[PDB]
Write a protein that binds this ligand. Structure first.
Ligand SMILES: [Zn+2]
Ligand SMILES: [Zn+2]
Lengths: 117, 117
């Protein structure tokens, strides 16, 4: 009802976790096909959930920055910088022990989300 | 709607993961207070989800066996033995790298579930 039975519902958002690896842009396109987007993380609850839903391997999430511009969410929303992004790259990934940046071309598993309903 | 926003919805069930450790019996009582039960795992999808929702630490789930009797789910349902339980103890736990048995008195984190709605 709230989410497809095959997606995971938590804190008013529906999540999908990939089984294959793609670059950040290709992962975002895959998310977009489901009416979703690389995961937007608005709270500590979401972050802790994702860091665990991810597992041991790095997973792309929805923060990216274009040269000379600020970090921006995958859905275009501006990032309020509620958490700090380590590293020197332009796309963000997470896994259980960390949230950091990696070259956007790297093929990683990914997580998408979209609002409930 | 389907589950409390604070619980995790997947495959028609709502999940809760503890932040503290308890014995199997005490964990089951905590689950029961929420109208839930130590997690019943009916499919490979549920199992893979739980092994990841759990993380690196062992978490009690809903399979236990009384001496001389078969493994039984925490809600009283008989176990169809769709998966094998390793070890020589009487309560089942899981984490990302395994699902096995442990002495029921051991205090572990736990996972509860209950049907959607
Ligand atoms: Zn879809
Ligand atoms: Zn409750």
């Amino acid at each position: 009802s709230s989410c497809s039975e095959d997606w995971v519902g938590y804190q008013r958002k529906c999540y999908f976790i990939s089984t294959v690896k793609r670059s950040w842009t290709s992962a975002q396109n895959a998310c977009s096909e489901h009416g979703a987007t690389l995961a937007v993380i608005d709270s500590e609850k979401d972050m802790n959930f994702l860091k665990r839903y991810a597992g041991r391997e790095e997973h792309w999430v929805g923060l990216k920055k274009e040269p000379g511009h600020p970090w921006k969410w995958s859905n275009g929303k501006e990032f309020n910088n509620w958490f700090n992004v380590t590293g020197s790259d332009k796309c963000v990934f997470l896994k259980n022990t960390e949230v950091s940046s990696m070259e956007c071309e790297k093929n990683l598993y990914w997580i998408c989300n979209k609002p409930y309903k």
